[PDB]
Ligand binder design. Sequence first.
Ligand SMILES: Nc1ncnc2c1ncn2[C@@H]1O[C@H](CSCC[C@H](N)C(=O)O)[C@@H](O)[C@H]1O
Lengths: 265, 265
Amino acid sequence: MVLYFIGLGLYDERDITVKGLEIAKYCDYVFAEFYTSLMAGTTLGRIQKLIGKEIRVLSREDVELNFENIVLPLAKENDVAFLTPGDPLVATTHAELRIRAKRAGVESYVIHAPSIYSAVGITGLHIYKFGKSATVAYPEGNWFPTSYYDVIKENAERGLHTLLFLDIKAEKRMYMTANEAMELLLKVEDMKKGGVFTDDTLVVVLARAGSLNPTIRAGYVKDLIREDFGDPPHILIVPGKLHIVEAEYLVEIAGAPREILRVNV
Amino acid sequence: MVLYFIGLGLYDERDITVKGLEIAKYCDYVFAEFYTSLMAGTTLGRIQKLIGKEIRVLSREDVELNFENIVLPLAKENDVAFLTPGDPLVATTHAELRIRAKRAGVESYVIHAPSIYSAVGITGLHIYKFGKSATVAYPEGNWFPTSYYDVIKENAERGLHTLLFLDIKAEKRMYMTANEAMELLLKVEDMKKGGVFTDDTLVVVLARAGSLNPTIRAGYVKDLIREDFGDPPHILIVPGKLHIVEAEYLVEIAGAPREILRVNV
Ligand SMILES: Nc1ncnc2c1ncn2[C@@H]1O[C@H](CSCC[C@H](N)C(=O)O)[C@@H](O)[C@H]1O
């Protein structure tokens, strides 16, 4: 009688922690959601094979509206696991589900897994220098989200880097690319004209983190906006002022223009 | 010809990912460093037994001064693994090691694992609201560093949370407790009087993240300063203004006082 929130990691079924896998194997029922992020290097079948259980996938509605009706009931007489991509409580609203588990008299435990939030360390940018994060959401109807632009502005003014989660429409299988994010940002710039995001802005793209060969690229928007970064998921980063060692890594590992080595102190 | 940076995760020998374990077993030689952080929930012996490999531990000097003489030579003609606590490259000095590998004509790949940076999501605080991060360092001699206090001020001022890594003397295996961190912050406050950290400041303590029984506590400094949060490692967080959902999680999961539901939202 317990509910486990277990993260599956960044890219494939092997990104789950050993602890998570062993626990998942001891569970009676296994549920999961694959709408908060995209695991581009595996399939449900492969995940099911590793765990050795039949995984029942839930939609955003099943979870947000009926988690206490689909999962919690079974957790009262069995050990149940709820699997999610990356880390279960990062950039998701799953934390609140623990409250539902409590109010249902069910004890819950959390098993972490690699998260894109920390995986960005592979870009060479100092993790402690990342400020507030934001999500670039697809505009819909007459609604055109722009809050992420102000986040970049605020962080940049403080010399902090900005991590930009990219939008996803799992049911429509739509995964926003870094290219699309840049296009949207250039549009917001023309509107607000704050000089926050332009063709000369240095950005960093990380695609398919977790894979053995993720795409890590750094350069100016004018140069990368049309570059092919490979299959999704993608994450976009707008660095603040760089430390010399950050610039060196971007040049040596992410193929950034050598001119950025010359920092303006 | 290959060097694999493999994260060991948060607390014990099972926090490594399945991918990291299989690759560690696949490698011919395995090195590891325990100076950027420690794995408090296990021992070198237990890690070795899990991997089934002899593990050569490296000191900060071994790595910072002689990485290219100790690790890379073998990586040139063999598959070599370099284990680090948490997620590789979160520690600021790890990144440049990939440049050294490049210089020596050695390929390198990163296998991620959970980091405390993302693991803080278990506190119920929204990850996007975390701003710049900082480390609380023990004062010594005539040196009293206090930049971490300023980090809190700047973050809180913008309604952002502040993750505070607590000092660790890896070699001496000594951990700064949240209690000691709170006392230091109160001292800094008494010196700067910026009204950033007082007895009425709401803080969150996360101890032994990764274990199945971490200590998650939230409350005002005046009540938590002498509380026993259990064995290390301890992490201190000074949240900024809270979203009602964050506050409710702290009350329901971290035993925070109901007062935060009206004072800190
Ligand atoms: N492997 C990966 N590579 C690049 N971006 C990734 C990624 N995994 C997730 N993301 C990014 O983050 C978004 C999902 S947000 C949910 C994140 C998840 N809980 C975690 O811990 O990683 C995606 O739309 C994408 O922009």
